[PDB]
Chain A
Amino acid sequence: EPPKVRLEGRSTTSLSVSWSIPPPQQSRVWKYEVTYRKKGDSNSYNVRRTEGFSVTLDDLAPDTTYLVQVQALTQGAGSKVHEFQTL
């Protein structure tokens, strides 16, 4: 069952993301795949990966909708695509 992604740390240049997989299944499956990008433009994924439950995506573009998705490393399913906006 895919992780659930939500935001608590928006900024002008910073978008800080958080996910919360349920504890029963917390088999701590390696790392978490945070697959972010811009919108329909500059394609540099700049994807970051971490085993924790939250990431602080830095050096982001102001007043831009970045597209984000979190995937369980799968060493099996990824989360739904999410759209967040900088400040």
Chain B
Amino acid sequence: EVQLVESGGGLVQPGGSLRLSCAASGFDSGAYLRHWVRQAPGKGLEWVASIYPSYGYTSYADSVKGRFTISADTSKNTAYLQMNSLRAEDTAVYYCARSAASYYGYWHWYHFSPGMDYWGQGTLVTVSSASTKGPSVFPLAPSSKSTSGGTAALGCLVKDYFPEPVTVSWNSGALTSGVHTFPAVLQSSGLYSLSSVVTVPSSSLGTQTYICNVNHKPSNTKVDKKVEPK
């Protein structure tokens, strides 16, 4: 039923601007407050700001204070988070959340506010000094020493791409058992890098083909390279 579909995101550079917009179907807006909170990947939650759509009472967080500007329109049944003076820390997945009501509630008894009953979904917001880049794919093959009746580890290294995400598949998805697609990590220079591996019995090694299917939709890159024993 009731949702808080958000929008915006993409990529902007440090000292940039990205105006976030969160629509709202189902619930009678104006009363249920709209809240912006960031979930920086790997770390936890960080509240950005809150506002009471009908009365329009501004509430910002010290981390982002002044940089952003929150607003909304009761007619549009939608809220707006204006992101300005973006800095490196601002990289996060932004979340939209709905709160309670009661003008008395917001005033006087505020500290007794109910929690964010209805949340949004998240849209990637990456602030970096680069451009859409396709990854480089290199193989990670085992050798004949690694035998031990069924132990052979191989995989693909997806290096130096931007922005997230990339999808990784093995033999057009068929190879799924054992696959440990690692979460992405960034290289000190500022480019994304992950690894994807899978364990196989040391009997089928040559007989069985291993094609890691990598896709970088951001730059419409589709790499279908095979991993051969060395």
By a CB distance below 8 angstroms, the chain B residues around A47 are: 100-102, 104-105
Complex Cα distance, B143 from A81, in Å, reads: 77
How many of chain B's residues touch chain A, expressed as a range? 10 to 19
B109, A33: Cβ atoms under 8 Å? no
Complex Cα distance, B103 from A73, in Å, reads: 8
B113, A45: Cβ atoms under 8 Å? yes
List 8 A–B pairs whose Cβ atoms lie within 8 Å, in order of A's numbering.
Answer: A33-B103, A35-B104, A35-B109, A45-B100, A45-B112, A71-B102, A74-B103, A78-B104
Q: Is B165 an interface residue when CB atoms closer than 8 A count as contact?
A: no
A37, B103: Cβ atoms under 8 Å? no
- Given A37-B109, A49-B31, check contact A43 B114 (CB 8 Å): yes
Complex Cα distance, B188 from A16, in Å, reads: 63
B103, A71: Cβ atoms under 8 Å? yes
* CB-nearest residue of chain A to B105: A45
B114, A44: Cβ atoms under 8 Å? yes
By a CB distance below 8 angstroms, the chain A residues around B100 are: 45, 47
* Per-position 1/0 for B14-56, Cβ under 8 A of A: 0000000000000000010000000000000000000000100
Complex Cα distance, B101 from A29, in Å, reads: 17
By a CB distance below 8 angstroms, the chain B residues around A85 are: none
**SS of B interface (majority):** loop
- Within the complex, what minimum Cβ distance (angstroms) separates B148 from chain A? 58
By a CB distance below 8 angstroms, the chain B residues around A49 are: 31, 101
Q: Is A11 an interface residue when CB atoms closer than 8 A count as contact?
A: no
Q: Is A27 an interface residue when CB atoms closer than 8 A count as contact?
A: no
- Within the complex, what minimum Cβ distance (angstroms) separates A83 from chain B? 14
B101, A43: Cβ atoms under 8 Å? no
* CB-nearest residue of chain B to A44: B114
* Per-position 1/0 for B95-124, Cβ under 8 A of A: 000001111110001011110000000000
A37, B112: Cβ atoms under 8 Å? yes
- Within the complex, what minimum Cβ distance (angstroms) separates A45 from chain B? 5
Complex Cα distance, B111 from A71, in Å, reads: 18
Q: Is A86 an interface residue when CB atoms closer than 8 A count as contact?
A: no
- Given A37-B109, A49-B31, check contact A69 B114 (CB 8 Å): no
B104, A33: Cβ atoms under 8 Å? yes
Cβ contact of B105, chosen from A35, A73, A74, A75, cutoff 8 A? A35
9 further A-B pairs in the complex, CB-CB below 8 A; given A35-B102, A46-B114, A47-B102: A33-B101, A35-B105, A43-B112, A43-B114, A45-B109, A45-B112, A47-B100, A69-B104, A74-B103
Complex Cα distance, B111 from A33, in Å, reads: 18
* Per-position 1/0 for B175-199, Cβ under 8 A of A: 0000000000000000000000000
In order of increasing CB-CB distance, the 6 nearest A-B pairs are A43-B112, A47-B102, A35-B104, A35-B102, A44-B114, A71-B104
- Within the complex, what minimum Cβ distance (angstroms) separates A51 from chain B? 13
